[PDB]
Design a protein around this ligand. Sequence first.
Ligand code: P6Y
Ligand code: K
Ligand code: K
Ligand code: ZN
Length: 357
Amino acid sequence: PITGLVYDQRMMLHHNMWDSHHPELPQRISRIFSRHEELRLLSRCHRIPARLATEEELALCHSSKHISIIKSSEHMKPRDLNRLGDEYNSIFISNESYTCALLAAGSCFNSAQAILTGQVRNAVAIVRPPGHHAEKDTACGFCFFNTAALTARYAQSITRESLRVLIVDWDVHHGNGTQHIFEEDDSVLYISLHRYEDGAFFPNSEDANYDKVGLGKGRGYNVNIPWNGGKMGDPEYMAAFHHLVMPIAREFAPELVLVSAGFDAARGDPLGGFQVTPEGYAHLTHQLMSLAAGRVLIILEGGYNLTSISESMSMCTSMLLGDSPPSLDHLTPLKTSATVSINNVLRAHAPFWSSLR
Ligand SMILES: O=C(NO)c1ccc(CNC(=O)c2cccnc2C(F)(F)F)cc1
Ligand SMILES: [K+]
Ligand SMILES: [K+]
Ligand SMILES: [Zn+2]
Protein backbone atom coordinates (compact mmCIF):
# COMPACT_ATOMS: atom_id res chain seq x y z
CA PRO A 1 0.00 0.00 0.00
CA ILE A 2 2.41 2.65 -1.29
CA THR A 3 1.67 6.22 -2.40
CA GLY A 4 3.91 7.71 -5.07
CA LEU A 5 4.94 11.35 -5.21
CA VAL A 6 6.58 13.19 -8.10
CA TYR A 7 8.07 16.68 -7.73
CA ASP A 8 10.96 18.23 -9.64
CA GLN A 9 12.07 21.80 -9.05
CA ARG A 10 13.08 22.13 -12.72
CA MET A 11 9.39 22.83 -13.39
CA MET A 12 9.82 26.13 -11.53
CA LEU A 13 11.88 27.51 -14.44
CA HIS A 14 8.76 28.42 -16.44
CA HIS A 15 8.05 32.04 -15.54
CA ASN A 16 6.40 35.31 -16.59
CA MET A 17 9.15 37.66 -17.74
CA TRP A 18 6.90 40.74 -17.87
CA ASP A 19 4.78 40.21 -14.74
CA SER A 20 6.76 38.39 -12.06
CA HIS A 21 3.67 38.55 -9.80
CA HIS A 22 1.41 36.63 -12.19
CA PRO A 23 -0.56 34.13 -10.05
CA GLU A 24 0.70 30.99 -11.87
CA LEU A 25 3.94 31.22 -9.86
CA PRO A 26 7.00 28.96 -9.88
CA GLN A 27 6.63 28.73 -6.10
CA ARG A 28 3.22 27.03 -6.44
CA ILE A 29 4.90 23.65 -6.68
CA SER A 30 7.73 24.30 -4.22
CA ARG A 31 5.22 25.48 -1.60
CA ILE A 32 3.11 22.35 -1.98
CA PHE A 33 6.26 20.23 -1.73
CA SER A 34 7.46 22.12 1.35
CA ARG A 35 4.12 21.59 3.09
CA HIS A 36 4.39 17.84 2.48
CA GLU A 37 7.81 17.92 4.15
CA GLU A 38 6.51 20.10 6.99
CA LEU A 39 3.65 17.68 7.70
CA ARG A 40 6.05 14.69 7.45
CA LEU A 41 4.02 13.32 4.54
CA LEU A 42 6.92 13.25 2.05
CA SER A 43 8.85 10.53 3.88
CA ARG A 44 5.71 8.35 3.88
CA CYS A 45 5.64 8.41 0.05
CA HIS A 46 7.74 6.63 -2.56
CA ARG A 47 9.45 9.21 -4.74
CA ILE A 48 8.81 8.79 -8.47
CA PRO A 49 11.21 10.61 -10.82
CA ALA A 50 10.23 13.21 -13.36
CA ARG A 51 11.00 12.67 -17.03
CA LEU A 52 10.42 14.43 -20.34
CA ALA A 53 7.41 13.46 -22.35
CA THR A 54 8.51 12.57 -25.86
CA GLU A 55 7.12 14.29 -28.94
CA GLU A 56 5.53 10.97 -29.94
CA GLU A 57 3.75 10.96 -26.59
CA LEU A 58 2.52 14.54 -27.06
CA ALA A 59 1.02 13.43 -30.38
CA LEU A 60 -1.37 11.15 -28.46
CA CYS A 61 -3.48 14.29 -27.95
CA HIS A 62 -1.85 17.23 -29.77
CA SER A 63 -1.34 18.30 -33.37
CA SER A 64 2.14 18.26 -34.84
CA LYS A 65 1.79 21.99 -35.59
CA HIS A 66 1.02 22.89 -31.98
CA ILE A 67 3.88 20.73 -30.67
CA SER A 68 6.25 22.36 -33.17
CA ILE A 69 5.27 25.90 -32.20
CA ILE A 70 5.68 25.44 -28.44
CA LYS A 71 8.89 23.50 -29.11
CA SER A 72 10.23 26.40 -31.21
CA SER A 73 9.68 28.84 -28.34
CA GLU A 74 12.69 27.42 -26.49
CA HIS A 75 14.95 29.38 -28.87
CA MET A 76 12.95 32.60 -29.12
CA LYS A 77 14.08 36.02 -28.06
CA PRO A 78 11.73 37.80 -25.63
CA ARG A 79 10.02 39.66 -28.49
CA ASP A 80 8.72 36.43 -30.02
CA LEU A 81 7.94 35.01 -26.60
CA ASN A 82 5.72 37.96 -25.70
CA ARG A 83 4.12 38.14 -29.15
CA LEU A 84 3.65 34.37 -29.46
CA GLY A 85 2.16 34.24 -25.97
CA ASP A 86 -0.27 37.03 -26.84
CA GLU A 87 -1.54 34.90 -29.76
CA TYR A 88 -3.21 32.57 -27.23
CA ASN A 89 -5.93 33.15 -24.66
CA SER A 90 -4.18 33.80 -21.30
CA ILE A 91 -0.66 32.44 -21.90
CA PHE A 92 2.81 33.61 -20.95
CA ILE A 93 5.91 31.88 -22.35
CA SER A 94 9.57 31.81 -21.33
CA ASN A 95 12.47 29.92 -22.92
CA GLU A 96 11.96 27.16 -20.32
CA SER A 97 8.20 26.77 -20.79
CA TYR A 98 8.30 23.92 -23.32
CA THR A 99 10.70 21.77 -21.27
CA CYS A 100 8.69 22.41 -18.10
CA ALA A 101 5.47 21.32 -19.83
CA LEU A 102 7.29 18.19 -21.05
CA LEU A 103 8.42 17.42 -17.48
CA ALA A 104 4.89 17.93 -16.14
CA ALA A 105 3.53 15.36 -18.58
CA GLY A 106 6.37 12.85 -18.23
CA SER A 107 6.13 13.04 -14.45
CA CYS A 108 2.51 11.99 -14.76
CA PHE A 109 3.32 9.22 -17.24
CA ASN A 110 5.85 7.75 -14.79
CA SER A 111 3.24 7.99 -12.02
CA ALA A 112 0.54 6.27 -14.06
CA GLN A 113 3.05 3.57 -15.02
CA ALA A 114 3.94 2.98 -11.37
CA ILE A 115 0.24 2.71 -10.49
CA LEU A 116 -0.65 0.40 -13.37
CA THR A 117 2.32 -1.94 -12.83
CA GLY A 118 1.51 -2.22 -9.12
CA GLN A 119 4.63 -0.44 -7.85
CA VAL A 120 2.38 2.00 -5.98
CA ARG A 121 -1.33 1.93 -5.22
CA ASN A 122 -1.91 5.62 -5.89
CA ALA A 123 0.12 8.79 -6.46
CA VAL A 124 0.31 12.57 -6.37
CA ALA A 125 1.97 14.75 -9.04
CA ILE A 126 3.12 18.22 -7.95
CA VAL A 127 3.58 19.68 -11.44
CA ARG A 128 3.35 22.90 -13.43
CA PRO A 129 2.45 24.43 -15.86
CA PRO A 130 -1.09 23.05 -15.70
CA GLY A 131 -2.80 21.27 -18.55
CA HIS A 132 -6.57 21.04 -18.65
CA HIS A 133 -7.25 24.12 -20.84
CA ALA A 134 -4.77 22.97 -23.50
CA GLU A 135 -6.48 21.91 -26.73
CA LYS A 136 -5.37 19.52 -29.44
CA ASP A 137 -4.13 22.44 -31.54
CA THR A 138 -3.55 25.32 -29.15
CA ALA A 139 -2.39 26.46 -25.73
CA CYS A 140 -4.80 28.22 -23.40
CA GLY A 141 -5.26 29.44 -19.84
CA PHE A 142 -1.68 28.91 -18.54
CA CYS A 143 -1.63 25.39 -20.12
CA PHE A 144 0.55 24.21 -23.01
CA PHE A 145 -0.11 20.45 -23.25
CA ASN A 146 -3.00 18.59 -21.68
CA THR A 147 -1.15 16.61 -19.03
CA ALA A 148 -4.20 14.70 -17.73
CA ALA A 149 -5.50 13.89 -21.22
CA LEU A 150 -2.02 12.73 -22.28
CA THR A 151 -1.73 10.57 -19.16
CA ALA A 152 -5.03 8.86 -19.91
CA ARG A 153 -3.83 7.97 -23.42
CA TYR A 154 -0.39 6.97 -22.13
CA ALA A 155 -2.10 4.68 -19.61
CA GLN A 156 -4.04 3.02 -22.43
CA SER A 157 -0.84 2.65 -24.49
CA ILE A 158 0.82 0.51 -21.78
CA THR A 159 -2.26 -1.55 -20.94
CA ARG A 160 -4.95 -1.88 -23.58
CA GLU A 161 -6.60 0.65 -25.84
CA SER A 162 -9.97 0.31 -24.07
CA LEU A 163 -8.70 0.84 -20.49
CA ARG A 164 -11.48 2.76 -18.73
CA VAL A 165 -10.04 6.02 -17.39
CA LEU A 166 -12.11 8.42 -15.31
CA ILE A 167 -10.93 12.04 -15.20
CA VAL A 168 -12.48 14.04 -12.36
CA ASP A 169 -11.66 17.74 -12.86
CA TRP A 170 -12.33 19.67 -9.67
CA ASP A 171 -10.38 22.76 -10.70
CA VAL A 172 -12.76 25.70 -10.40
CA HIS A 173 -12.53 26.23 -14.18
CA HIS A 174 -13.92 24.04 -16.92
CA GLY A 175 -11.32 21.78 -18.51
CA ASN A 176 -12.31 22.77 -22.04
CA GLY A 177 -9.24 21.06 -23.47
CA THR A 178 -9.92 17.69 -21.87
CA GLN A 179 -13.63 17.83 -22.73
CA HIS A 180 -12.85 18.39 -26.41
CA ILE A 181 -10.04 15.82 -26.59
CA PHE A 182 -12.32 13.03 -25.33
CA GLU A 183 -15.69 14.35 -26.47
CA GLU A 184 -16.24 11.44 -28.88
CA ASP A 185 -14.59 8.83 -26.64
CA ASP A 186 -16.36 6.32 -24.40
CA SER A 187 -13.12 4.93 -22.91
CA VAL A 188 -12.34 8.16 -21.01
CA LEU A 189 -15.16 9.50 -18.83
CA TYR A 190 -14.75 13.25 -18.21
CA ILE A 191 -16.50 14.75 -15.17
CA SER A 192 -15.89 18.43 -14.44
CA LEU A 193 -17.21 20.61 -11.62
CA HIS A 194 -16.71 24.29 -12.34
CA ARG A 195 -17.85 27.83 -11.74
CA TYR A 196 -19.90 28.74 -14.82
CA GLU A 197 -22.12 31.80 -14.17
CA ASP A 198 -24.08 31.24 -17.39
CA GLY A 199 -20.85 31.44 -19.38
CA ALA A 200 -19.60 34.55 -17.51
CA PHE A 201 -16.53 32.80 -16.10
CA PHE A 202 -13.30 31.70 -17.74
CA PRO A 203 -13.02 30.05 -20.20
CA ASN A 204 -16.30 31.85 -21.08
CA SER A 205 -17.90 29.17 -23.28
CA GLU A 206 -21.28 27.47 -23.25
CA ASP A 207 -19.27 24.30 -23.91
CA ALA A 208 -19.12 24.02 -20.12
CA ASN A 209 -22.89 23.78 -19.65
CA TYR A 210 -24.64 20.65 -18.36
CA ASP A 211 -26.23 19.76 -21.71
CA LYS A 212 -22.88 19.01 -23.36
CA VAL A 213 -23.02 15.26 -22.75
CA GLY A 214 -20.55 14.06 -25.38
CA LEU A 215 -20.79 13.25 -29.07
CA GLY A 216 -21.02 10.11 -31.16
CA LYS A 217 -19.88 7.05 -29.25
CA GLY A 218 -19.03 9.47 -26.44
CA ARG A 219 -22.64 10.41 -25.64
CA GLY A 220 -23.04 10.15 -21.88
CA TYR A 221 -19.28 10.22 -21.25
CA ASN A 222 -18.92 13.98 -20.70
CA VAL A 223 -20.43 15.27 -17.44
CA ASN A 224 -20.38 19.03 -16.77
CA ILE A 225 -21.56 20.17 -13.33
CA PRO A 226 -21.80 23.97 -13.71
CA TRP A 227 -22.21 26.34 -10.74
CA ASN A 228 -24.15 29.60 -11.02
CA GLY A 229 -25.00 32.36 -8.56
CA GLY A 230 -23.40 31.17 -5.34
CA LYS A 231 -20.15 30.98 -3.37
CA MET A 232 -19.96 27.21 -3.50
CA GLY A 233 -18.11 25.15 -0.90
CA ASP A 234 -17.99 21.76 0.86
CA PRO A 235 -21.78 21.16 1.06
CA GLU A 236 -22.25 21.69 -2.69
CA TYR A 237 -19.24 19.60 -3.72
CA MET A 238 -20.27 16.82 -1.33
CA ALA A 239 -23.81 16.91 -2.76
CA ALA A 240 -22.49 16.88 -6.33
CA PHE A 241 -20.34 13.85 -5.45
CA HIS A 242 -23.25 12.06 -3.74
CA HIS A 243 -25.84 12.68 -6.47
CA LEU A 244 -23.69 12.71 -9.61
CA VAL A 245 -19.95 12.05 -9.52
CA MET A 246 -19.89 8.83 -7.52
CA PRO A 247 -23.06 7.19 -8.96
CA ILE A 248 -21.85 7.80 -12.53
CA ALA A 249 -18.27 6.79 -11.71
CA ARG A 250 -19.34 3.51 -10.08
CA GLU A 251 -21.50 2.62 -13.09
CA PHE A 252 -18.60 3.39 -15.46
CA ALA A 253 -16.30 1.20 -13.29
CA PRO A 254 -12.99 2.89 -14.15
CA GLU A 255 -9.71 1.03 -14.12
CA LEU A 256 -7.72 4.21 -13.44
CA VAL A 257 -8.81 7.51 -11.88
CA LEU A 258 -7.03 10.74 -12.77
CA VAL A 259 -7.85 13.87 -10.80
CA SER A 260 -7.36 17.18 -12.58
CA ALA A 261 -6.80 18.58 -9.13
CA GLY A 262 -6.83 22.33 -9.35
CA PHE A 263 -7.15 23.98 -5.97
CA ASP A 264 -8.61 27.30 -7.12
CA ALA A 265 -12.06 26.39 -5.78
CA ALA A 266 -10.39 26.57 -2.36
CA ARG A 267 -11.21 28.99 0.41
CA GLY A 268 -8.82 31.91 -0.05
CA ASP A 269 -8.14 31.56 -3.77
CA PRO A 270 -7.77 34.99 -5.43
CA LEU A 271 -9.48 33.89 -8.68
CA GLY A 272 -12.06 31.20 -7.92
CA GLY A 273 -14.26 32.91 -5.35
CA PHE A 274 -15.35 29.58 -3.79
CA GLN A 275 -14.76 28.11 -0.33
CA VAL A 276 -13.93 24.41 -0.59
CA THR A 277 -11.88 23.59 2.53
CA PRO A 278 -8.81 21.33 2.87
CA GLU A 279 -11.00 18.81 4.69
CA GLY A 280 -13.47 19.00 1.80
CA TYR A 281 -10.76 18.06 -0.69
CA ALA A 282 -9.74 15.23 1.64
CA HIS A 283 -13.29 13.87 1.56
CA LEU A 284 -13.47 14.12 -2.23
CA THR A 285 -10.16 12.24 -2.47
CA HIS A 286 -11.27 9.58 0.02
CA GLN A 287 -14.43 9.01 -2.02
CA LEU A 288 -12.52 8.59 -5.28
CA MET A 289 -10.20 6.09 -3.55
CA SER A 290 -13.15 3.66 -3.49
CA LEU A 291 -13.00 3.42 -7.32
CA ALA A 292 -10.67 1.50 -9.64
CA ALA A 293 -9.32 -0.60 -6.75
CA GLY A 294 -7.74 2.56 -5.35
CA ARG A 295 -5.76 3.40 -8.51
CA VAL A 296 -5.91 7.19 -8.24
CA LEU A 297 -3.41 9.75 -9.58
CA ILE A 298 -3.85 13.32 -8.33
CA ILE A 299 -2.48 15.88 -10.83
CA LEU A 300 -2.00 19.54 -9.90
CA GLU A 301 -3.87 21.93 -12.21
CA GLY A 302 -4.69 25.47 -11.06
CA GLY A 303 -4.93 27.03 -7.61
CA TYR A 304 -3.30 30.32 -6.72
CA ASN A 305 -3.37 30.94 -2.96
CA LEU A 306 -0.02 29.40 -2.00
CA THR A 307 -1.14 28.61 1.55
CA SER A 308 -4.52 27.22 0.42
CA ILE A 309 -3.13 24.92 -2.29
CA SER A 310 -0.33 23.64 -0.02
CA GLU A 311 -2.74 22.68 2.76
CA SER A 312 -5.34 21.36 0.31
CA MET A 313 -3.07 19.13 -1.79
CA SER A 314 -1.29 17.86 1.35
CA MET A 315 -4.62 16.74 2.80
CA CYS A 316 -5.29 14.86 -0.43
CA THR A 317 -1.97 13.02 -0.11
CA SER A 318 -2.78 12.23 3.52
CA MET A 319 -5.92 10.47 2.26
CA LEU A 320 -3.97 8.54 -0.40
CA LEU A 321 -1.65 7.38 2.39
CA GLY A 322 -4.63 5.84 4.22
CA ASP A 323 -5.21 8.41 6.95
CA SER A 324 -8.77 8.78 8.18
CA PRO A 325 -10.80 11.70 6.78
CA PRO A 326 -10.84 14.85 8.90
CA SER A 327 -14.22 15.98 10.15
CA LEU A 328 -16.26 18.25 7.92
CA ASP A 329 -18.02 21.33 9.21
CA HIS A 330 -21.71 20.88 10.09
CA LEU A 331 -22.66 21.48 6.40
CA THR A 332 -25.20 24.21 5.64
CA PRO A 333 -28.18 23.58 3.35
CA LEU A 334 -27.16 23.78 -0.30
CA LYS A 335 -27.23 27.07 -2.10
CA THR A 336 -30.54 26.87 -3.94
CA SER A 337 -28.89 27.39 -7.34
CA ALA A 338 -26.63 24.44 -6.50
CA THR A 339 -29.72 22.24 -6.29
CA VAL A 340 -30.87 23.69 -9.62
CA SER A 341 -27.45 22.90 -11.13
CA ILE A 342 -27.41 19.35 -9.76
CA ASN A 343 -30.94 18.68 -11.03
CA ASN A 344 -30.10 20.00 -14.52
CA VAL A 345 -27.13 17.62 -14.75
CA LEU A 346 -29.32 14.76 -13.48
CA ARG A 347 -31.89 15.43 -16.20
CA ALA A 348 -29.15 15.74 -18.83
CA HIS A 349 -27.51 12.42 -17.88
CA ALA A 350 -30.52 10.35 -16.86
CA PRO A 351 -30.73 9.09 -20.50
CA PHE A 352 -27.30 7.47 -20.16
CA TRP A 353 -26.70 6.43 -16.52
CA SER A 354 -29.29 4.17 -14.92
CA SER A 355 -27.90 4.93 -11.44
CA LEU A 356 -29.42 8.43 -11.77
CA ARG A 357 -33.00 7.22 -12.34
O1 P6Y B 1 -6.07 28.01 -15.19
C1 P6Y B 1 -6.65 28.94 -14.66
N1 P6Y B 1 -7.02 28.86 -13.30
O2 P6Y B 1 -6.66 27.65 -12.81
C2 P6Y B 1 -6.99 30.21 -15.31
C3 P6Y B 1 -6.82 30.40 -16.67
C4 P6Y B 1 -7.14 31.60 -17.26
C5 P6Y B 1 -7.63 32.70 -16.57
C6 P6Y B 1 -7.97 33.98 -17.31
N2 P6Y B 1 -7.31 35.24 -16.95
C7 P6Y B 1 -7.63 36.02 -15.85
O3 P6Y B 1 -8.50 35.71 -15.04
C8 P6Y B 1 -6.90 37.30 -15.60
C9 P6Y B 1 -7.30 38.47 -16.24
C10 P6Y B 1 -6.63 39.67 -16.03
C11 P6Y B 1 -5.55 39.69 -15.15
N3 P6Y B 1 -5.14 38.59 -14.51
C12 P6Y B 1 -5.81 37.44 -14.74
C13 P6Y B 1 -5.20 36.29 -13.93
F1 P6Y B 1 -3.93 35.99 -14.24
F2 P6Y B 1 -5.20 36.63 -12.64
F3 P6Y B 1 -5.85 35.13 -14.01
C14 P6Y B 1 -7.80 32.51 -15.20
C15 P6Y B 1 -7.49 31.29 -14.58
K1 K C 1 -13.21 21.69 -13.42
K1 K D 1 -15.55 11.42 -22.99
ZN1 ZN E 1 -8.40 26.81 -12.71
